[PDB]
C-alpha cells in the first residue's frame, strides 16, 4: 500500500515531465524541418524558415546542428527516464 502509493506520487511527476519533453520535441521538429532539404514530414514554422534562410551559410549549418543536437538530447533524456 505505502510502497505503491509512494511510487504513484513519483510516477506522476515523471509522467508530467515526459509530456513536457514531448512538447519541446514537437516544437523543435517544426524548427528543424525548416532547415532540412527533405520534404517536411510535419509542420514547418514558416517564419523561422524565412529567418534562417536569411542567415549566412555557416550560420545556417550551425543552427541546423544545434537543433539536431537538442533533439538528440531530448530523446536521450526520454529513454533515460
Amino acid at each position: 500500500e505505502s510502497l505503491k502509493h509512494a511510487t504513484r506520487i513519483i510516477d506522476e511527476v515523471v509522467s508530467k515531465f515526459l509530456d513536457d519533453l514531448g512538447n519541446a520535441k514537437s516544437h523543435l521538429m517544426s524548427l528543424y524541418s525548416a532547415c532540412s532539404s527533405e520534404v517536411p514530414p510535419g509542420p514547418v514554422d514558416q517564419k523561422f524558415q524565412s529567418i534562417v534562410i536569411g542567415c549566412a551559410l555557416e550560420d545556417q549549418k550551425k543552427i541546423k546542428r544545434r537543433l539536431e543536437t537538442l533533439l538528440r538530447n531530448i530523446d536521450n533524456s526520454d529513454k533515460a527516464i
Partner: protein, 377 residues
C-alpha cells in the same frame, strides 16, 4: 468595441480604434497579419498561421485564395486558369465553384464564402483574445470592383462568423480614411490609391467632397504582385545554378521552395539595402547555394513588370476623365509598394509629388476599417 477587418486574398488583418488610436491586433504568434489559409486534417481544421505551416505535408487539403472565387462561375476563364496553380480540388456544383478537401477522413466541399467565413472567425477570435471582450460588431472591406452579390456574400460570411457587419466598405476608401483624407478642408479632392500586394494589383481613383466618397474608376491586374517579382528571381537563379553546377533543381519541390523563400527574403532586403546575399545550406545534392544580387539587377529582372504598373494608372485617369495633375493625394497600400523603383516610377509619373506611405502598407486597409468601425459604433 467594433473592429475593422481587412479580408485579403493572401492574408487578413484586424484592427480596433480605441482611445483615439488605432491598434493593429497581433495573433497568437505575434503576427499583425494572418494568412487567409484553411486546412483540413484527419483530426482538425486549422486556420491562419497553423494552416500555412503545414501546407507542405498536406498540400491537397490546405485551401487559400478563396477570395479569387467569390462571385465567380465555375466555367469562368479565370477560375479554370487559377485551378491549375492550386493543389486543392475545385468542383462545379450547379455552375458554382466549390473547394473540395478531405476532412477527418471525409470528403467535404465548401463555397468560397464559407472559407472566407472561417477566416473571419479566426480574425474575430484574434480580436477577442486581445480585447478580452466579445467582439460582435465589425466593418469588413472588399475590392472596389466587387458587385452587389460579391458584397452580400462577404456580408453573409461575416454574419455566419457571428459578426454584425456594420458596413462593407471598399479597400481603397478604407486606405483613404486611414490617412484622414476625408477630414480635410476644401472642394472636391481626387485621390489615387495604388495597391500592389503579394498577388494582385489594383488602382482606384476616388473623389472626396465633404466626407462623401465616390469611386471614379478602377483598374489593375488581378494576377500581378510581389510573388511574380520573386518568381522572376527564382527562375533566374535556377538557371544560374544550372549554369554554375550543371544541376537542374526544378523537379525537387523542396529545393525550389527554399530557393523561393530565399528570393522573397532577398527582395525585402533590397527595399532597404542596395544589395542582398542569397545563401542556402545544401540546396541540392548537398551543394550549397551561394550568390548575391544588387538592387539594380533585381530591377532589371522585373523592369517590364515595374514599368507596367503605370498602364493601369493611365487607364484609371483616362476613365475618371482626369489629367494626372488633378490628383490631389496618392496612397500606397500593399507590401509590394515598398519597392523603391516602384515608388520612383510612380513619383516621377506625377512630377515628383510626395506619396502617402507612412502607414504600414500591409495594415493601412485594416487601419481605415478600424477607424470607420469606431465611428459606426
Amino acid at each position: 468595441p467594433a473592429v475593422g477587418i481587412d479580408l485579403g486574398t493572401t492574408y487578413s488583418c484586424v484592427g480596433v480604434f480605441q482611445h483615439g488610436k488605432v491598434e493593429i491586433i497581433a495573433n497568437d504568434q505575434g503576427n499583425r497579419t494572418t494568412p487567409s489559409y484553411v486546412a483540413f486534417t484527419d483530426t482538425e481544421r486549422l486556420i491562419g498561421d497553423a494552416a500555412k505551416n503545414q501546407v507542405a505535408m498536406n498540400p491537397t487539403n490546405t485551401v487559400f485564395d478563396a477570395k479569387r472565387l467569390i462571385g465567380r462561375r465555375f466555367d469562368d476563364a479565370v477560375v479554370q486558369s487559377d485551378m491549375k496553380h492550386w493543389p486543392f480540388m475545385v468542383v462545379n456544383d450547379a455552375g458554382r465553384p466549390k473547394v473540395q478537401v478531405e476532412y477527418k477522413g471525409e470528403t467535404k466541399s465548401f463555397y468560397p464564402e464559407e472559407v472566407s467565413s472561417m477566416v473571419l472567425t479566426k480574425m474575430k477570435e484574434i480580436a477577442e483574445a486581445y480585447l478580452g471582450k466579445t467582439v460582435t460588431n465589425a466593418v469588413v472591406t472588399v475590392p472596389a470592383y466587387f458587385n452587389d452579390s460579391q458584397r452580400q456574400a462577404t456580408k453573409d460570411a461575416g454574419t455566419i462568423a457571428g459578426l454584425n457587419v456594420l458596413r462593407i466598405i471598399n479597400e481603397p476608401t478604407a486606405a483613404a480614411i486611414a490617412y484622414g483624407l476625408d477630414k480635410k478642408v476644401g472642394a472636391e479632392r481626387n485621390v489615387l490609391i495604388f495597391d500592389l500586394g503579394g498577388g494582385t494589383f489594383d488602382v482606384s481613383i476616388l473623389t472626396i467632397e465633404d466626407g462623401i466618397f465616390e469611386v471614379k474608376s478602377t483598374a489593375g491586374d488581378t494576377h500581378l504582385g510581389g510573388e511574380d517579382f520573386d518568381n522572376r528571381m527564382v527562375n533566374h537563379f535556377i538557371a544560374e545554378f544550372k549554369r554554375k553546377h550543371k544541376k537542374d533543381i526544378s523537379e525537387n519541390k523542396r529545393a525550389v521552395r527554399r530557393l523561393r523563400t530565399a528570393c522573397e527574403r532577398a527582395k525585402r532586403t533590397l527595399s532597404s539595402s542596395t544589395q542582398a546575399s542569397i545563401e542556402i545550406d545544401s540546396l541540392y545534392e548537398g551543394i550549397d547555394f551561394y550568390t548575391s544580387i544588387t538592387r539594380a539587377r533585381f530591377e532589371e529582372l522585373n523592369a517590364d513588370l515595374f514599368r507596367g504598373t503605370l498602364d493601369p494608372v493611365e487607364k484609371a485617369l483616362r476613365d475618371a476623365k482626369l489629367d494626372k495633375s488633378q490628383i490631389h493625394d496618392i496612397v500606397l497600400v500593399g507590401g509590394s509598394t515598398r519597392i523603391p523603383k516602384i515608388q520612383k516610377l510612380l513619383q516621377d509619373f506625377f512630377n515628383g509629388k510626395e506619396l502617402n506611405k507612412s502607414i504600414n502598407p500591409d495594415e493601412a486597409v485594416a487601419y481605415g476599417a478600424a477607424v470607420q468601425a469606431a465611428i459606426l459604433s
